[PDB]
């Protein structure tokens, strides 16, 4: 099984206190981009 | 095997309100409840109430329902098997019936009854309330004395004069000498403050290779002065 983390202020690594179980990723669109990303997911937070 | 540490243990006047708190170290804090207790000389050990760090389920003691209002913070994980998370508990009593020493600690299985048990205990802060205000530390020495001139051991100590609210912690050489070092509780003058004594035994031949430095420290009067116990004794037995 995969699993997702679910706290907004989570930074790159560390244990995640808020966790919920998935088996298949949300819809990732493989955008071919160098130096920038766009049309991607967006966290409800201030971009950390 | 998790440690719990409160903070200071000092003075206050009947009217105001000061709050004391107690933080986990080495284990998870959340799925284990909260508690605080008293053991006043007048009414002995006594329990108050809990809540839960997770959601919040309190059940206080009828004695202290109507006065005391308290909140606690959130998770600070350390790793999948240990954490931290704050918990802050305010008082409001205005009665010196509650002057004693205050613990707050926890530890349990959690899915059976017996559903609160205090297990892994904190420092115990010591809540001295007073109408008299803070009186700060001065400090002077104790001349060495003979303990056993056959065994070649002596006893030298340090000041611990009258000061207001106890406790009052005094280390020497700031830590690295704990063997044999001995200090004892204070007294109560009939006008209302304390005093004890400080003495430690050392071999009599240790006078010119080691330094002996007591250090006086009362925090609410924020004073702390360090001393040099003069090793020259006046005991005839020790003089031999």
């Amino acid at each position: 099984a995969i699993l997702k983390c679910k706290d907004k202020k989570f930074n790159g690594t560390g244990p995640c206190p808020s966790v919920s179980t998935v088996q298949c990723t949300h819809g990732i669109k493989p955008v071919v981009s160098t130096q920038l990303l766009l049309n991607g997911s967006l966290a409800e937070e201030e971009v950390m | 095997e998790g440690q719990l540490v409160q903070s200071g243990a000092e003075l206050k006047k009947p009217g105001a309100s000061v709050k004391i708190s107690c933080k986990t170290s080495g284990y998870r804090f959340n799925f284990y409840h909260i508690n605080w207790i008293r053991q006043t000389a007048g009414r002995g050990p006594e329990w108050m109430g809990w809540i839960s760090p997770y959601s919040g389920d309190k059940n206080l003691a009828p004695a202290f329902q109507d006065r005391v209002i308290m909140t606690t913070d959130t998770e600070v994980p350390v790793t999948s098997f240990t954490s931290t998370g704050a918990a802050y508990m305010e008082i409001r009593n205005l009665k010196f019936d509650d002057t004693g020493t205050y613990f707050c600690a926890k530890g349990l299985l959690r899915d059976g009854s017996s559903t609160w048990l205090p297990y892994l205990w904190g420092q115990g802060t010591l809540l001295t309330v007073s109408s008299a205000s803070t009186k700060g530390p001065s400090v002077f020495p104790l001349a060495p004395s003979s303990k056993s001139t056959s065994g070649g051991t002596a006893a030298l100590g340090c000041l611990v004069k009258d000061y207001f609210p106890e406790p009052v912690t005094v280390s020497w050489n700031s830590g690295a000498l704990t063997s044999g070092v001995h200090t004892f509780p204070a007294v109560l003058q009939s006008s209302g403050l304390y005093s004890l004594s400080s003495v430690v035994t050392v071999p009599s031949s240790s006078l010119g290779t080691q330094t002996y430095i007591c250090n006086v420290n009362h925090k609410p009067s924020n004073t702390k002065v360090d001393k040099r116990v003069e090793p020259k004794s006046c005991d005839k037995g020790l003089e031999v």
Binding site: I2, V22, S41 | -
Partner: protein, 42 residues
């Protein structure tokens, strides 16, 4: 101190939205101690 966008490799494109996720094994069987036990057939 100064600095500048790099994009030396692309899979940083993949870290963009594959950072919630982590695959994990099922070890579904555990031994543990209780008092039950069925008839000793002897």
């Amino acid at each position: 101190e100064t600095f500048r966008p790099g994009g030396g490799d692309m899979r940083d494109n993949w870290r963009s939205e594959l950072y919630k996720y982590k695959v994990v094994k099922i070890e579904p069987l555990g031994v543990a101690p209780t008092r039950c036990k069925r008839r000793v057939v002897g």
